[PDB]
Design a protein around this nucleic acid. Structure first.
Ligand SMILES: [K+]
Ligand SMILES: [K+]
Ligand SMILES: [K+]
Ligand SMILES: [K+]
Ligand SMILES: [K+]
Ligand SMILES: [K+]
Ligand SMILES: [Mg+2]
Ligand SMILES: [Mg+2]
Ligand SMILES: [Mg+2]
Ligand SMILES: [Mg+2]
Ligand SMILES: [Mg+2]
Ligand SMILES: [Mg+2]
Ligand SMILES: [Mg+2]
Lengths: 107, 191, 173, 203, 244, 141
RNA sequence: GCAUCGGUUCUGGCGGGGGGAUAAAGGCCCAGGGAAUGUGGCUCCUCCGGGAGUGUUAUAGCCCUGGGUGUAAUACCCUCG
RNA sequence: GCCAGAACGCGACGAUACUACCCGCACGUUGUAGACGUAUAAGAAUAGGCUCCGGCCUCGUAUCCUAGCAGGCGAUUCCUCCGCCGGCCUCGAAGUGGCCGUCGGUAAUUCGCGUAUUGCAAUUUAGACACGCGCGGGAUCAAAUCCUUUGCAGACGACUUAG
């Protein structure tokens, strides 16, 4: 019975902040989206919502899981990387962790 | 300056067969089998006619093209040796001390061995091992003569050079002391 | 699309002792018309006693290739400067337009003789009408009869973003 | 691009430096890598040039005490490759240390990683990068000549595992031959119109 | 500037860490390389040092000055009661070196060996191999023969375990010494057959070595304490009027 | 004399060879410029297979197994068009495996969400018959 | 969170107008002139695939010079939405 | 060959009291550089290869799997696919796979009942390893240090010995 999964988002990875060679700006992050490899493909995802979910120690209001919400703003480079802004900047220990790219604001 | 097309040809007698596979050449004839590996050269083989082999190099540099004639001669010698064979001769040269040579055929390895004694009156004894497939023999037509024969020109020539290079005079004027064993004639077993 | 051939006509300013001065015409290869005019005064300064402050430009026109679909052989005469002394050369090219021939020449001189754009004078560009007028052996092999050749060891084109192939690529395309 | 749980790379025929830079970037992104057959890697240029390079490396050592601080010269083929990767990573940071924890390197193919799929990095393959006529060497030969002791042990073990693979390949060929026969017999059995609908869809 | 006159350095850097040895018993770091065409045999033994004495013999060395004349030479005496074989070990080749995968013992062990596994033997319960011995009486010792078959199939180096009978010497010590001795010989099956047939049997030194043979001796040297540079390395003494 | 040679056999660039370009178009070679460039044109009636007259770099082309016989060197567009249609280049190109692969790829990319559901269900019905047949032959060994 | 707006900015697509040799080419048609990396024929050498002569459209075609369709199309530069 | 032996490198073996050990079940008072279909084993050449021997190769742009209350309860219908156990073989590079049997589940076809109200979005609290706790069953009855002693050892610790 129903040997299928339940996935409605696209996978992504947190790479780093916006930076120069020796200066870094945490207010913006760079995200790699799986499967997109050029600027034209990345134009589809402008404006979507991004979620970063993780675990904590204690329960607050019925759970031990927390979220930080954000959105995609503009492309980056020539190879499909994009920029994003979150409500709070990401913790920077998560360089290499995974995020969820929604489809909420559609067409 | 690259050359678009360079080509050479090789005729083949009706008494033998040739096989090429992944640039590995096998020549089969009335006197034995020979093999050669040419996987370090970018060349194209083909069958031009009923009994002619073709060699091609496309878009080659001046340095690259120089190796086309080299490959042709090597394979051609392989055909000649398998159908006629090679034969080198050496001669003893001495002034005062005679040179004594003894030749024995080893049993475990099937090779030939050559021993040299009394070179400029030295007490040490010199020993050289011939390459497999090369046969040595003391001459009976004339004195102080060695005869080396075989199918591979590379094998016969390198073995003959081993004998010549082992006998040297040290700390003397070699324009005056001319003793040694030297190659004097190169030819074929047949004809 | 880097160069075009222009026609430039110039003149000395008319004076009372010489109304109606003579007119001079040159053919200039340049990326645009602003540097076409600057190149004109450079060459004329070396031949006649005229300057830009004592002359004026009469006309500028673009010369287009008459048959940019026919394969041609070209010959070029030039003069250039090395690190010590100046020399004359003659080279040959095979393409479909005069503009294409000059662009190939500029790349060729930079590669083989380290000559910059600022140290080359073009003397003459001529289309060779007869197949007997070909002199250089690297052109002669291209005008041979019944030409044909294969292409061995061709690397297939693979997207950069696709790392981690699951099979060994071939080179027999 | 694709996210995997682990990627296993067959090291035969890859150029040492180019494979090293690609592997380093994957680790910093958050991908786990395993490299096998490190003895079959390649280096461009003649062998004699590679030997002179290592000898210059060997001459460097701490003067006042050779047991501390000094460059420690590892000899195994997998440790030569590991050194090249570590130079392209900020290994003195906590982030850099975590990245190196996602990599494994081996000589030969140890039992965990046979019976598994091995990929290839075409941006670093020798037959696709090097101009024909140039010269190259193998890391396995360089290691043998600077003091690596287990070249023949690995050579004998590799022969055994290839002999087992020949038996496995024989079974795999039989299965394909039967599956093709089953599809032929079942095709003309039943499907009256499913065949044409699938063909129109491209399947 | 350069040193005024030349002189070699004092001492050798090959024996460099001048520290106390890790173990009291000597350690065999290599064995003679194996030849499968020779009969199976042992390659080492152990004994105790008694002292030195003097002998007289006539030399045989053509061309020498003392040819066919008597000479005086010093010798050393080693006390060697027989050894008892207790078990064997197997080894395999890996890309990381040799490692041992099995070892199988004998059914009965003497109190000499069992003292080696203890540091307070006088107040222990002495249960060292009590449960292992029962493996010989279960299923006709199928577990014992299973391990022997494993060595025949995978291993390529076989060694034996042997200990001294220290009660036959005038020493006050009661705890024996134990070591591994490699077997060089025909085949791996032959090595196991030979090694197991020697279980809890004495082996005499005359079956291992013979007369007019060159051998090597491994041991730990005599100990001095904290020593200064003059005696430890052999440096020149400084003048008589040197302060400090 | 016995000679057994096993080596490569490439397709040659020549006057009359038909090339395939990046965007599925076709062209015929009329003149060779260098070892890297060629003058070509394709006068095809099908708007998806036609290309203008011009120079093509050989690095962006593939050699098809089709060669127009006796195409004069340097022939103009009118002469090429006549020989193109007389030989039947369009019909020959449709029978190659390269064309069929392209057609299959186009069909799969044009599937909607409802089509994807139906192709899953249709494959299962064919798969059911496959497993029954495979079990029968394998059981009989 | 969504909808309708204001300020700034990044990025896609579509419809027109003007210029130059009133683009240059090019397809089709008319008239004249040439040759060769010489098509078909004719001759000789090999049947062993072919090669060598001869000469100007034939059973292929190519290059120059004028004219018509034609205020043709398209590229490039500028410009109104 | 010869010296040292990583005090955060590894292997084999002996005996293991204190519920320290083994098995089964059920929980979370917990941790993890970061599950969400975490699905894919030939070797070799690249100026050559694969094969069912008919043929095939730019291209993983592939193949497998994929529907039902986060996936219910019945029927029609089918003999496919999946899993826990048990028995035989097999596996040594850092030990794995295959065959068989019982049992449990199961849209390839076609239907009948149920779904609402989480109120127009808010992580889809779902995996795998470790660790802790509580039961119910089995198995087991050990050593080390101080202390006295030795001198093959020694500044003191440490070391070779005996009780
Ligand atoms: K001094
Ligand atoms: K806009
Ligand atoms: K116009
Ligand atoms: K016209
Ligand atoms: K003719
Ligand atoms: K239902
Ligand atoms: Mg002298
Ligand atoms: Mg000095
Ligand atoms: Mg004093
Ligand atoms: Mg706005
Ligand atoms: Mg007009
Ligand atoms: Mg117009
Ligand atoms: Mg240690």
């Amino acid at each position: 019975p129903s040997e299928a999964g339940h996935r409605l988002y696209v996978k992504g990875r947190h790479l780093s902040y916006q930076r120069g060679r020796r200066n870094t700006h945490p207010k913006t992050s760079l995200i790699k989206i799986e499967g997109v490899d050029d600027t034209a493909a990345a134009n589809f995802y402008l404006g979507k919502r991004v979620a970063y979910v993780y675990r904590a120690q204690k329960e607050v209001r019925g759970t031990k899981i927390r979220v930080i919400w954000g959105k995609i703003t503009r492309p980056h480079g020539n190879s499909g990387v994009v920029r994003a802004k979150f409500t709070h900047p990401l913790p920077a220990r998560s360089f290499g962790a995974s995020v969820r790219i929604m489809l909420y604001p559609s067409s | 300056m690259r050359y678009i097309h360079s080509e050479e040809t090789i005729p083949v007698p009706e008494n033998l067969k040739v096989s090429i596979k992944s640039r590995l050449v096998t020549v089969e004839g009335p006197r034995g089998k020979l093999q050669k590996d040419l996987s370090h050269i970018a060349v194209n083989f083909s069958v031009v006619k009923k009994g002619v082999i073709g060699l091609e190099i496309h878009h080659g540099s001046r340095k690259d093209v120089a190796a086309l004639r080299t490959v042709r001669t090597i394979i051609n010698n392989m055909i000649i040796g398998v159908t006629k064979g090679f034969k080198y001769k050496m001669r003893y040269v001495y002034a005062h001390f005679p040179i004594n040579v003894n030749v024995e055929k080893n049993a475990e390895t099937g090779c030939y061995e050559v021993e040299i004694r009394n070179f400029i009156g030295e007490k040490i004894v010199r020993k050289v091992v011939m390459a497999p497939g090369v046969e040595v023999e003391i001459s009976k037509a004339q004195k102080d003569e060695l005869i080396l024969s075989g199918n591979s020109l590379e094998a016969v020539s390198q073995s003959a050079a081993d004998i010549q290079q082992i006998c040297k005079v040290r700390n003397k004027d070699i324009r005056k002391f001319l003793d040694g064993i030297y190659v004097s004639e190169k030819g074929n077993i047949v004809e | 699309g880097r160069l075009q051939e222009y026609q430039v006509i110039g003149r000395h300013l008319p004076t009372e002792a010489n109304p109606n001065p003579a007119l001079y015409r040159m053919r200039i290869f340049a990326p645009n018309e602003v540097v076409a005019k600057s190149r004109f005064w450079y060459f004329l300064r070396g031949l006649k006693k005229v300057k830009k402050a004592t002359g004026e430009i009469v006309s500028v026109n673009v010369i287009s290739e008459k048959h940019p679909l026919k394969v041609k052989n070209f010959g070029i005469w030039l003069r250039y400067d090395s690190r010590s002394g100046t020399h004359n050369m003659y080279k040959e090219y095979r393409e479909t337009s005069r503009v294409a021939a000059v662009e190939a020449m500029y790349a060729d001189m930079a590669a083989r003789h380290r000559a910059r754009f600022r140290s080359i004078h073009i003397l003459k560009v001529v289309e060779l009408e007869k197949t007997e007028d070909v002199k250089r052996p690297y052109i002669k092999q291209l005008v041979a009869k019944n030409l044909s050749f294969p292409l061995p060891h061709r690397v297939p084109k693979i997207s950069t973003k696709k790392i981690f192939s699951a099979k060994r690529p071939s080179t027999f395309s | 691009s694709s996210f995997e749980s682990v990627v296993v790379i067959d090291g035969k025929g890859h150029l040492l430096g180019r494979l090293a830079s690609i592997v380093a970037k994957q680790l910093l992104s958050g991908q786990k890598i395993v490299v096998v057959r490190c003895e079959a890697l390649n280096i461009s240029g003649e062998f004699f040039r590679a030997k002179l390079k290592y000898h210059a490396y060997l001459r460097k050592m701490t003067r006042y005490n050779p047991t501390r601080g000094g460059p420690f010269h590892f000899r195994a083929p997998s440790r030569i490759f590991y050194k090249a990767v570590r130079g392209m990573i900020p290994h003195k940071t906590a982030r850099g240390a975590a990245a190196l924890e996602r990599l494994k390197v081996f000589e030969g193919v140890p039992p965990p990683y046979d019976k598994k799929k091995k990929m290839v990095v075409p941006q670093a393959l020798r037959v696709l990068r090097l101009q024909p006529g140039r010269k190259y060497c193998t890391v396995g030969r360089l290691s043998h000549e600077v003091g690596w002791k287990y070249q023949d042990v690995v050579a004998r073990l590799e022969e055994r595992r290839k002999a087992k693979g020949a038996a496995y390949y024989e079974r795999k060929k039989l299965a394909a031959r039967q599956l093709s026969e089953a599809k032929k017999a079942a095709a003309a059995k039943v499907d009256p119109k499913v065949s044409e609908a699938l063909a129109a869809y491209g399947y | 500037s350069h040193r005024k006159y030349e002189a070699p350095r004092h001492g050798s850097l090959a024996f460099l860490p001048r520290k106390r040895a890790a173990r009291h018993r000597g350690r065999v770091k290599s064995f003679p390389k194996d030849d499968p065409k020779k009969p199976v045999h042992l390659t080492a033994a152990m004994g105790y040092k008694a002292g030195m004495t003097t002998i007289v013999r006539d030399l045989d060395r053509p061309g020498a000055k003392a040819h066919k004349k008597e000479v005086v030479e010093a010798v050393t005496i080693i006390d060697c009661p027989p050894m008892v074989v207790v078990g064997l070990v197997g080894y395999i080749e890996t890309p990381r070196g040799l490692r041992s995968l099995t070892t199988v013992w004998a059914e009965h062990l003497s109190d000499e060996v069992k003292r080696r596994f203890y540091k307070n033997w006088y107040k222990s319960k002495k249960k060292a191999f009590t449960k292992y011995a029962k493996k010989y009486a279960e299923n006709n010792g199928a577990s014992i023969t299973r391990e022997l078959e494993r060595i025949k199939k995978y291993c390529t180096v076989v060694r034996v375990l042997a200990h001294t009978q220290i009660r036959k010497t005038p020493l006050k010590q009661k705890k024996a010494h134990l070591m591994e001795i490699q077997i060089n010989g025909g085949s791996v099956a032959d090595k196991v057959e030979f090694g197991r047939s020697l279980f809890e049997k004495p082996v005499t030194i005359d079956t291992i070595f013979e007369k007019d043979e060159m051998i090597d001796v491994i041991a730990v040297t005599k100990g001095h304490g904290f020593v200064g540079v003059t005696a430890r390395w052999g440096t020149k003494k400084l003048p008589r009027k040197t302060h400090k | 004399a016995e000679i057994n040679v096993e080596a490569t056999s490439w397709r040659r660039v020549e006057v009359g060879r038909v090339l395939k370009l990046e965007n599925g178009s076709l062209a015929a070679i009329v003149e060779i410029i260098d070892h890297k460039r060629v003058l070509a044109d394709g006068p095809s009636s099908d708007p998806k297979l036609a290309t203008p007259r011009g120079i093509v770099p050989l690095s962006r082309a593939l050699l098809t197994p089709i060669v127009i016989p006796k195409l004069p060197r340097g022939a103009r567009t009118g002469a090429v068009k006549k020989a193109w249609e007389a030989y039947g280049v369009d019909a020959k190109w449709k029978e190659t495996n390269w064309a069929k692969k392209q057609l299959q790829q186009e069909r799969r990319q044009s599937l909607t969400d409802f089509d994807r559901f139906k192709v899953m269900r249709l494959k299962k019905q064919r798969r059911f018959e496959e497993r029954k047949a495979l079990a029968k032959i394998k059981a009989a060994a």
